[PDB]
């Protein structure tokens, strides 16, 4: 059986007959009395096989002795009953029947083959109208439809010498007569003469179809069914329920429909019935077969017993519920159990409490086995009864089996790989599973009733893979980002914080101790507080140049508590690690430090120790929560009454006339958002310190030991945000739309809400809860699209030996360095010997892993930019090299060859999204946004650097910017970039280019609400095309009468104004057009949707002035709800609705033709003599002016860049970096750390395919899409041997299409669109050789990755011989 590949092709009528073991003539199922199969019925034993093992129906032959003995009397073979699951039958159809899948499934094969629209074919099939098959007399040609009356006319006149027919016989004849060869040549001749752009595609697609049809050896006639296969009985079973009733598959109802109507058709043909009735029966027969194959596609699905449509054949394969997703890509499993989880604080990290009775059952065969080797059980049945009796000796045996046997714990949902971990089980009395606290993070396990699956690895291999790869201890770091996932939280953090943190004097201030032991003795004796300042003598062990540890002893001021924690601290670490007051943030660093210095086993022990001490002192402390612990600032009511009269004054000014709904919404939200911060900061000053403790004499200030403050500062649980709602002000709540309620909640939870505040709270709350239920689906769907796309990607090679890489710079967005270069290039193979500033000696080599040590050297020299080897630029065909990838972030060393990288990438991108969906939503009520992006104030002194900027000087003296992309940077002395600041359009700069500013200076102010339209030239203002009611609207005031103009867009605009672009035009005193300095362009500023102009026509403007205020409603809330669609749009490679234009080729440009206003920008390069001419909309305004030497991909229009255009012009590293940064922008906004290398994996999978120009020595020709690896393989042999050279162009595929473009149809089918995938594969006669992971999992084989990579590579070399 063991096979190489799988092929799919159209079934011949005769092929179908081959599988069949007889024709089922009758609908009879079984006999009502003897519930046995009827004669030649659907469950016929004569056809499908015997009902009982080695027994004929009439009962003449029994027992295993009779083998293949076909009983003469009843006609039933004596074999196993198993055969009735494998043997098929068939049905002889009276009329030919079209196969719905090739007819209806779009595009369709029957239609595309005949070049005949679907409508025409259907009219033929339902017997509405005749179709001409062939007329030698050109009178009537081919495929021309004739109605009932049209058929009567030609029939008298010509007749006979012209053949026209109706129904599937007609289409089958039309398919039989069609010559694939000749039409291929005719279509090639058409493309040579007159290739129209859009119809070249469709002609080339029918050519590919015809070529592929002939290569597959499929025949078009076979699209029409003459023989209809019958599914084996056991796969459509009729079984008796306990109640005496029977239950059957719906396939039986559909087969019985088909047989009844088919047999009735045979009858009406024997009886020579009039043709109207024959036709009705042929329609009904095709309806029944189409219902049986795919019910619901051919229109209204056939409803059975309830009203629900019958489940057809295709429905059992297709849906998620089909067979792929449900029974094949995942299954129900033996030696599996579940129960509620509960804490096991006593456990070590590698252990879990497993209930006695649960473990008894899971290890049943292992018990049976040891019982027989000890001779305590005589046989298996006696062993079973000893277990049933639960005898005392059995417990002792079970204890012996479980020893050193790992068990898998799983929690739904399994978002990332740490959702499964292996543990050594500890038998416990009681029904609950006991989970180690420190791994609760990876499972997202909280013990308020969560449950876990238990699974027993049976084989020695599976045991070893669980102990080595999947063990809790061995999976400490997140595979997503380098950080430890195994991190103390809650009680443990609080306890270590309580121990380390210091108090004034307390018991035994300024004592002296011999080591941490005198300290612990003092504390436990009750002569010292843990917070006493005290001078102790501790001996730290620091690593030297070799592996030897150096010992150092010195006196250092510390608390008692920190000295005692030093006892837990392994030798190697500095005492300075414990000498600070420890929080969760510091403890995570502690465990990472320990892991990189000492190694895995020490950190494992150290982690457990930290957990034990943390709980222990947490409990000693007795920290708790009283209502007096929630302290309200005395000065809340003042801040609020101030804020409240202020907002009141703006509401009164609203009726007056300075305010739109959007403007006032922004102004009120800003007032309350600042008030909330003020009251919060008042509470946190009052609470964080405001500790008056008398030091040894006088008063002092120190940090408060208020319970809730300690909880927040330690990071044990709540954040400052939660405690704002407790003790401060609850704040502005956001509606389910995302738009924020204008009235905030002034009160807090200690104060108590009133009926109205509580009701208003509900909106945000319920939208949060509904968000977790509904939005989780799209997060998860993105995980699944990512996984399918990057399943195949495996580490194949160690070093491809590539120099190529992408220049990674330090991301410094929003002043404070967001992500440092050190961390970004931490654990990535370097490329190009990058030395120190002074180019005269190599510092670092080529192929070298960037370890924390190398990274620390990089920081002393302050390297800004480093070319590193990346997954995208790796040359390895059919996988990626360990060096291009770099460190396995989960292991803390170079990635192992055979590791399934793609899966890890998809999981690690997918997880945060799916977790942050439920997470931020149930946990928050209100939205605590801050929109005050008015002024840039610079934090450190330096000189202003403005890159990409074109601004005009206004009459104020001030530099008013009119560029779209503007990047203000803060350079120091030496000349490094340290702070960045995105200046917007319409900004006032305080100082111009390259000018010195001091610490805390404002350098640019702009309004956040309203993006103004700022004019470059000075003069008078003219209203072009601004007809009232047509394009704009007029709104008038009282006493004198101030009118204001609002630009209605095409949305509200009349048919009349549709073609008019409204624009404020700058004319001079004469009323001539003012030019824009130095160009031929006349000033004219095109006003968009709802551009609210105050100042009416003819007003003398100066330059740099605000013409028009377009309102900028930012109703967006800071959540993943808005973020994830951005991410999904990026990964799916979507062109935005207004793409910014780029130059295709380098060279010098002037303008040519114009269509009214529409620009036809003409590029005429320097070397490349061919021009490139583009049609451009009139209103889209250019950044570039005229004759400039612009290179490939210089930004011409305002707008977002399409990843397609980036790849196509700049190239791989450009587009990869665009995706990485634009995705990471979203995740970084939510505080999510994912390494770029994961995103880079998926982008590599996006850039899998490439289109080809010209031919090589293979079959390329014009515009075939082939995978990049395979065309590179061709190009390598071509360049050595020669032959026709082939130009190529890489194509971007966005996730869904990229997964369907994979040359495995088993992966394509399992993903989505299964019906369409299998028709296209069946017609192509496609052969799947099973290279991918999904393919191997489906056939139940060894994965070509991890453990399986060894075995799989041995099979590939067994292909070379034997």
């Amino acid at each position: 059986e063991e096979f190489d590949a799988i092929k799919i092709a159209l079934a011949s009528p005769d092929m179908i007959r081959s599988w069949s073991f007889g024709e089922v003539k009758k609908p009879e199922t079984i006999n009502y009395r003897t519930f046995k199969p009827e004669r030649d019925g659907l469950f016929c034993a004569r056809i499908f096989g015997p009902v009982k093992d080695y027994e004929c129906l009439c009962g003449k032959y029994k027992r295993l002795k009779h083998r293949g003995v076909i009983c003469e009397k009843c006609g039933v073979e004596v074999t196993q009953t198993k055969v009735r699951r494998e043997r098929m039958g068939h049905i002889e159809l009276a009329s030919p029947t079209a196969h719905i899948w090739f007819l209806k499934s779009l595009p369709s094969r029957i239609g595309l083959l005949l070049d005949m629209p679907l409508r025409d074919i259907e009219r033929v099939l339902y017997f509405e109208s005749y179709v001409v098959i062939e007329g030698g007399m050109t009178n009537l040609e081919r495929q021309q439809i004739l109605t009932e009356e049209q058929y009567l006319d030609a029939l008298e006149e010509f007749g006979d010498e012209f053949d026209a027919k109706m129904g599937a016989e007609a289409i089958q004849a039309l398919l039989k007569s069609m010559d694939l060869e000749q039409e291929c040549e005719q279509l090639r001749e058409e493309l040579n003469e007159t290739n129209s752009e859009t119809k070249r595609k469709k002609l080339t697609k029918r050519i590919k179809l015809l070529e592929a049809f002939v290569q597959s050896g499929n025949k078009p006639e076979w699209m029409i069914l003459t023989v209809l296969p019958v599914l084996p009985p056991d796969l459509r079973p009729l079984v008796p329920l306990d109640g005496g009733r029977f239950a059957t598959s719906d396939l039986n109802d559909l087969y019985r429909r088909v047989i009844n109507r088919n047999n009735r058709l045979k009858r009406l043909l024997d009886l020579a019935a009039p043709d109207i009735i024959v036709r009705n029966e042929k329609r009904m027969l095709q309806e029944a077969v189409d219902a049986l194959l795919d019910n619901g596609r051919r229109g209204r699905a056939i409803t059975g017993s309830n009203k629900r449509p019958l489940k057809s054949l295709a429905d059992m394969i297709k849906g998620k519920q089909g067979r792929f997703r449900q029974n094949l890509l995942g299954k129900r499993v033996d030696y599996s159990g579940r129960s509620v989880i509960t804490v096991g604080p006593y456990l070590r990290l590698h252990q879990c409490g497993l209930p006695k009775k649960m473990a008894l059952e899971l290890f049943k065969p292992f018990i049976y086995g040891k019982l027989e080797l000890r001779g305590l059980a005589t046989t298996i049945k006696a062993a079973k009864k000893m277990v049933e009796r639960e005898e005392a000796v059995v417990w002792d045996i079970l204890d012996e089996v479980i020893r050193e046997h790992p068990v898998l714990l799983n929690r739904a949902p399994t978002l990332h790989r740490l959702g499964i971990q292996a543990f050594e089980p500890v038998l416990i009395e009681g029904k609950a599973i006991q989970l180690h606290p420190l791994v609760c993070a990876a499972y997202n396990a909280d013990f308020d009733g969560d449950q876990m699956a238990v699974h027993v690895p049976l084989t020695l291999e599976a045991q070893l893979e669980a102990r080595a790869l999947m063990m809790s201890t061995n999976n400490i770091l997140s595979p997503a980002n380098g950080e430890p996932i195994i991190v103390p939280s809650q009680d443990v953090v609080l306890g270590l914080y309580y121990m380390t943190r210091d108090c004034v004097n307390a018991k035994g201030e300024g004592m002296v101790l011999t080591g941490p032991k005198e300290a612990e003795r003092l504390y436990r004796s009750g002569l010292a507080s843990l917070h006493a300042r005290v001078k102790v003598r501790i001996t730290e062990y620091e690593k030297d140049a070799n592996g030897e540890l150096v010992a150092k002893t010195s006196l250092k001021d510390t608390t008692v508590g920190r000295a005692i924690l030093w006892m837990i601290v392994p030798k190697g670490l500095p005492y300075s690690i414990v000498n600070q007051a420890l929080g969760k943030k510091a403890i995570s660093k502690m465990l990472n430090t320990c892991y990189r210095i000492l190694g895995l086993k020490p950190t494992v022990i150290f982690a457990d120790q930290i957990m034990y001490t943390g709980f222990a002192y947490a409990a000693r402390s007795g920290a708790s929560v009283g209502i007096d612990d929630m302290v309200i600032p005395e000065k809340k009511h003042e801040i609020i009454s101030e804020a409240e009269a202020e907002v009141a004054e703006i509401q009164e000014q609203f009726q007056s006339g300075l305010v739109t709904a959007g403007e006032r919404y922004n102004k009120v939200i800003d007032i309350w958002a600042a008030a909330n911060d003020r009251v919060s900061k008042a509470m946190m000053d009052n609470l964080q310190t405001e500790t008056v403790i008398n030091r040894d004499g006088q008063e002092e200030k120190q940090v408060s030991f208020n319970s809730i403050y300690m909880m927040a500062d330690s990071g044990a649980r709540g954040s400052a945000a939660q405690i704002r709602q407790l003790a401060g002000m609850r704040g502005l709540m956001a509606k389910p739309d995302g738009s924020i309620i204008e009235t905030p909640i002034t009160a807090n939870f200690r104060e108590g809400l009133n009926v109205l505040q509580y009701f208003i709270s509900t909106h945000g709350a319920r939208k949060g809860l509904a968000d977790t239920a509904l939005k989780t689906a799209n997060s998860g769907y993105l995980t699944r699209r990512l996984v399918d796309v990057a399943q195949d990607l495996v580490v194949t090679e160690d070093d491809c030996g590539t120099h190529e890489g992408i220049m990674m710079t330090p991301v410094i967005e929003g002043g404070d360095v967001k992500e440092p270069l050190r961390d970004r290039v931490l654990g990535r193979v370097t490329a190009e010997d990058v030395l120190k500033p002074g180019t005269a000696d190599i510092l670092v080599p080529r192929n070298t892993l960037l370890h924390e040590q190398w990274c620390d050297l990089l920081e002393e020299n302050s390297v800004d930019a480093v070319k590193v080897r990346s997954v995208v630029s790796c040359d390895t065909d059919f996988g990626v090299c360990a060096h291009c990838y770099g460190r396995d972030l989960a292991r803390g060393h170079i990635i192992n060859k055979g590791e399934a990288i793609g899966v890890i990438a998809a999981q690690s991108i997918g997880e945060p999204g799916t977790q942050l969906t439920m997470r931020t939503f149930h946990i928050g009520g209100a939205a605590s946004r801050a929109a005050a992006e008015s002024s840039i104030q610079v934090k450190n002194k330096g000189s202003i650097k403005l890159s990409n900027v074109k601004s005009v000087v206004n009459s104020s003296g001030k530099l008013v910017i009119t560029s779209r992309n503007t990047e203000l940077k803060l350079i120091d002395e030496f000349g490094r970039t340290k702070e960045s600041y995105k200046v917007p359009y319409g900004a006032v700069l305080a100082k111009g280019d390259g000018e010195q500013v001091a610490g805390g200076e404002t350098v640019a102010n702009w309004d956040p609400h309203t993006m103004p339209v700022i004019t470059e030239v000075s003069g008078f203002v003219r209203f072009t095309d601004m007809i009232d009611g047509q394009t704009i609207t007029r709104q008038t005031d009282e006493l004198t009468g101030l009118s204001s103009l609002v630009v209605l867009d095409s949305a509200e605009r009349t048919a009349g104004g549709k073609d008019l672009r409204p624009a404020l035009k700058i004319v001079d005193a004469q009323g001539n057009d003012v030019l824009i300095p130095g160009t031929d362009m006349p000033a004219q500023y095109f006003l968009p949707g709802k551009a609210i102009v105050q100042l009416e026509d003819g007003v003398q403007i100066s330059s740099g002035d605000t013409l028009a205020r377009i309102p900028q409603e930012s109703g967006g809330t800071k959540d993943i709800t808005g973020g994830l669609p951005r991410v999904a749009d990026l990964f799916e490679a979507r062109r935005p609705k207004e793409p910014a234009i780029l130059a295709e080729i380098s060279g010098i440009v002037s303008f040519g033709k114009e269509t009214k206003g529409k620009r036809r920008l003409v590029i005429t390069p320097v070397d490349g003599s061919d021009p490139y001419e583009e049609m451009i909309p009139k209103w889209r305004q250019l950044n570039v002016f005229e004759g400039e030497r612009v290179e490939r991909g210089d930004v011409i229009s305002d707008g977002p860049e399409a990843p397609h255009d980036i790849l196509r012009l700049r190239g791989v590293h450009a587009v990869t970096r665009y995706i990485v940064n634009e995705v990471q922008d979203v995740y970084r906004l939510q505080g999510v750390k994912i390494n770029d290398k994961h995103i880079e994996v998926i982008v590599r999978q996006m850039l899998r395919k490439a289109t080809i120009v010209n031919a090589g020595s293979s079959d390329f020709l014009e515009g075939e899409q082939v995978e990049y690896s395979r065309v590179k393989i061709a190009n390598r042999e071509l360049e050595a041997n020669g032959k026709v050279g082939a130009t190529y162009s890489r194509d971007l595929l966005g996730i869904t299409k990229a997964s369907l473009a994979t040359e495995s149809f088993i992966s394509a089918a399992s993903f989505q669109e299964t019906t369409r995938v299998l028709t296209e594969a069946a017609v192509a006669g496609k052969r799947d050789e099973l290279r991918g992971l999904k393919e191997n999992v489906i056939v139940g084989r060894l994965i070509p990755a991890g453990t399986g990579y060894a075995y799989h590579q041995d099979r590939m070399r067994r292909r070379a011989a034997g």
Binding site: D1049, S1050, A1051, A1055
Partner: protein, 49 residues
């Protein structure tokens, strides 16, 4: 939804033109539904049932 009349409007949705197309729906307790609706070209249409 209570039987009676209801006046609703696709707030954009159809036609990136972004036209608000107004509609009336008459809902009985028993019978066929009577729809009136606007088209982008401001033509009043009836959908019976």
């Amino acid at each position: 939804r209570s039987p009676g009349v209801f006046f609703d409007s696709d707030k954009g949705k159809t036609h990136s033109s972004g036209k608000v197309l107004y509609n009336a729906r008459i809902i009985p307790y028993r019978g066929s539904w009577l729809d009136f609706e606007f088209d982008p070209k401001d033509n009043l249409f009836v959908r019976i049932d």
